[PDB]
Amino acid sequence: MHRVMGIETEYGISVPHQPNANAMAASSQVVNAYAPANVILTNGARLYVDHAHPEYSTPEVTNPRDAVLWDKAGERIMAEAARRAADLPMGWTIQLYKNNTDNKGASYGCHENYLMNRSTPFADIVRHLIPFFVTRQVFCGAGRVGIGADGRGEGFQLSQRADFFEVEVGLETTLKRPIINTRDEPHADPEKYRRLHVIIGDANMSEIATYLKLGTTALVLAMIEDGFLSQDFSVESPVGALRAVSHDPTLRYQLRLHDGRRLTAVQLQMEYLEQARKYVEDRFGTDVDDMTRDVLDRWETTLVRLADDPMQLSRDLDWVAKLSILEGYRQRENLPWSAHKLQLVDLQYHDVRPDRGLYNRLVARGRMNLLVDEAAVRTAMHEPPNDTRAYFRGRCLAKFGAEIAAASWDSVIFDLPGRDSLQRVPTLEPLRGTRAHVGDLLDRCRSATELVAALT
């Protein structure tokens, strides 16, 4: 399975016993702590401050597995960053959570970037993506305690982000959040590529969840690009449908389509799945790779299980695991959904600390299914993907970092001693600057000036 993709995660940030502490200052403190506020790492990742939150952007990857890997590495980087920020002259102890809300009314996003054909019409993209994004929370949702934006309403829901979206298609602003964001900033050749920026997803702890989130979406995008979907999945009141699907963890809520049909979110998801299998069969036949197969099978199995029983998926999915823990607390202490302790558990599930994280403690108990090894995660902290331009960027920062003036997805800007102007090396193509392309060359060059010379 090949599509250029990435994940940008804004982490929840809290400084205990520090009412005066500023979110911007704390975020920048976290970023500057791991710095040894915008920095680029040797794994191709970016670490910065966005919307007053510490944010980790994975390097460009070609598959959901790698995405999961470098994202998970992002978590470790965040934890380490906070731990280091605690040791700086200002002793602020910073707690980071990978989640979408503080249940005080604040919302912060987890972005998914996909590269698509420029030739693909935006109308088709919207038309076929809307029902998908509305209903995908069934396996995607990380779960939330409390209903509504203020979280004052008593109950548990599938999606943290759902109550914060008021519109179908538009630009992301502080005032309104669209289901489909129209801002296009490819950082790739504009005629060749369009960048799909998806802000509706919850940050997922579970590797399976992130895997499905990225993978199934990649499949749907592939279908959209080939104009494979004849069917119209269009939903009346898609935003209300989003809220309503979120607010029914029993998964029995039916939403109304434009053709009149009533089906649940899981059912519409099954429609997308069968469409995906039909597509992949027709297109790739026998040559179909293991990862596409795995994503399809996991998608199907997850849906079927969700229909049969949600709670058997507790090892696979975030909201089901969290719900399991929460219901544990509820049976034990006789707590209604409005108990503060429940919201505290909800929050602590996303804590990036190894000992204090509930997802992490579940993993330590072997109670969560994992796609990748921790060794690969550790490696993915300091080292870039081989098949994208993040390889070139990362290895340049590692080897030539002393001579690097600046770095971005678009370019690497070198300071060549003895030269007036900074030497700007453009990386426009995400599929170039790979290990196959520049690997040997980077091995050869003893100097950044040598490298720049060889590239011209």
UniProtKB/Swiss-Prot annotation:
InterPro entries in the record: Pup_deamidase (IPR022366), Pup_ligase/deamidase (IPR004347)
Annotated catalytic residues: 50 (proton acceptor)
Cofactor dependency: ATP
Cofactor info, note text: ATP is required for the deamidation and depupylation reactions but is not hydrolyzed during the reactions.
UniProt entry keywords in alphabetical sequence: ATP-binding, Hydrolase, Magnesium, Metal-binding, Nucleotide-binding
EC number: 3.4.-.-
Effect in UniProt of substituting residue 111 to A: Abolishes depupylation but not deamidation activity
Pfam family, one: Pup_ligase
Coiled-coil annotated spans: none
Residues engaged in binding Mg(2+) 1: 8, 48, 55
Binding site for ATP: 57-58, 113, 195
Class of the enzyme per the UniProt entry, highest EC level: hydrolase
Pathway given in the UniProt record: Protein degradation; proteasomal Pup-dependent pathway
UniProt effect for mutating residue 53 to A: Reduces depupylation but not deamidation activity
A Gene Ontology molecular function term of the record: metal ion binding
Assembly mode: Likely interacts with the C-terminal half of the prokaryotic ubiquitin-like protein Pup.
Family as reported in the entry's similarity comment: Belongs to the Pup ligase/Pup deamidase family. Pup deamidase subfamily.
Protein name in UniProt: Depupylase
Phylogenetic placement of the source organism: Bacteria, Bacillati, Actinomycetota, Actinomycetes, Acidothermales
